[PDB]
Amino acid sequence: GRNVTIQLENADTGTLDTKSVVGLVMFSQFWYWFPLAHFLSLSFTPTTVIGIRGSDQAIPKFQMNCYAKEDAFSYPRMY
Amino acid sequence: VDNMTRILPQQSRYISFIKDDRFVPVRKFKGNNGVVVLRDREPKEPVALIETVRQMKD
Amino acid sequence: TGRDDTKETVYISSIALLKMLKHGRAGVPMEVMGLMLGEFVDDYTVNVVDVFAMPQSGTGVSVEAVDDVFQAKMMDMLKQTGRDQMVVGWYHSHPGFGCWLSSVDVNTQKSFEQLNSRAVAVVVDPIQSVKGKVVIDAFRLIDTGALINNLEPRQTTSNTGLLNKANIQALIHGLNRHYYSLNIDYHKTAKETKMLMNLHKEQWQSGLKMYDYEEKEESNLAATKSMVKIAEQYSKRIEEEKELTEEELKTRYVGRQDPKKHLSETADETLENNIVSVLTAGVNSVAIK
Numbered sequence: 436g437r438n439v440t441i442q443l444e445n446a447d448t449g450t451l452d453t454k455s456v457v458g459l460v461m462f463s464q465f466w467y468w469f470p471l472a473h474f475l476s477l478s479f480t481p482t483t484v485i486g487i488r489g490s491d492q493a494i495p496k497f498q499m500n501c502y503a504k505e506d507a508f509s510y511p512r513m514y
Numbered sequence: 515v516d517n518m519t520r521i522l523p524q525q526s527r528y529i530s531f532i533k534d535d536r537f538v539p540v541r542k543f544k545g546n547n548g549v550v551v552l553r554d555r556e557p558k559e560p561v562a563l564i565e566t567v568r569q570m571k572d
Numbered sequence: 573t574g575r576d577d578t579k580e581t582v583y584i585s586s587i588a589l590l591k592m593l594k595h596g597r598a599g600v601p602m603e604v605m606g607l608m609l610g611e612f613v614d615d616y617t618v619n620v621v622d623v624f625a626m627p628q629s630g631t632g633v634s635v636e637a638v639d640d641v642f643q644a645k646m647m648d649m650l651k652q653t654g655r656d657q658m659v660v661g662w663y664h665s666h667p668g669f670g671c672w673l674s675s676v677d678v679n680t681q682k683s684f685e686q687l688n689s690r691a692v693a694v695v696v697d698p699i700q701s702v703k704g705k706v707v708i709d710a711f712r713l714i715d716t717g718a719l720i721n722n723l724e725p726r727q728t729t730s731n732t733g734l735l736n737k738a739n740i741q742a743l744i745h746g747l748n749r750h751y752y753s754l755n756i757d758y759h760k761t762a763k764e765t766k767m768l769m770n771l772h773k774e775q776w777q778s779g780l781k782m783y784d785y786e787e788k789e790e791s792n793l794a795a796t797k798s799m800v801k802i803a804e805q806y807s808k809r810i811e812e813e814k815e816l817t818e819e820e821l822k823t824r825y826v827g828r829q830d831p832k833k834h835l836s837e838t839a840d841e842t843l844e845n846n847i848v849s850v851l852t853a854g855v856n857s858v859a860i861k
Binding site: 466 | 730732
């Protein structure tokens, strides 16, 4: 639904995501066997900040400041 | 920008929760997409929540 | 319900190809035939081990010309040597015609399906074996039933999709409404490869064998003379040829059949050779005495 990106690597340490490597080597071989296409899923990662209230373990509603040009990253059209 | 909404990696840099608000991170912002545990100043006054959906379906 | 039904890649042994070319070449232009003996493994790997030929009939390829007395008796000579393996199809050579399966050939193939329904029909075209090309193609019947209910996609599942689509019109129509055409790959052991590859005893000796010296004289003289004549063209060319409009420059000053380049190629080929020439004479003299 337009919420996922393919990461090269864990973004925290700067060091490879185990799952992401397996996805892409498996994806690249599909000429030989077509069903293995699906392995691109392990490479798919959701990208989103989810703030978690440490006093309930639930998702608080609140608003955060992003200094950016707001219109410049507008959500995609519907084709 | 609302909480629990699509944030591309590029807008993630600029993300900065209001200091004056109740929600202030317990450490310096992680700055990268992911669960960031926040300290709520006041449990007395209402905190509107989004209850996780898995528990309803389960 | 059943198998993947991807048409087999026909993996043709080094021997079976060598005999097939030889067999057709002898018979040309009269049609030639024989049976393919092989063994069937995997889903789509048919290893064509070896072939033998049946005596030329005055009926050409015919069910009539598949002569069971000959066939049987042959199985038996090969049996004693232990080289017998199941019949996995049949090949024949049309030189007269491109590679496709005639109506007569479709009946012939239908009998083979009873043995093995993955049997192949291989068309060898030995007239065009005189090029560097080997023109060979392999086929396997399709049932009419498959095409009527439009169930044909089953047979073309999970594949790279590279299909030879050379030869159309009547031929292609027939192919589409009767057989399926799929690739041929050649697998050979490195043992086989090496034996073939090896040449003469005198091959590794030849560098002290040398050209007759009257011919080296002749060649030295020819090259000096030839370049002179193309050098005239080149001098004329760079008198002018510094204007504009590319193609016009090439017609005005004869920049087509370009002199600079043709000269550079001849000059160097002769230069390299003359290094080899001296190299052999000096070595011969000194090594031996």
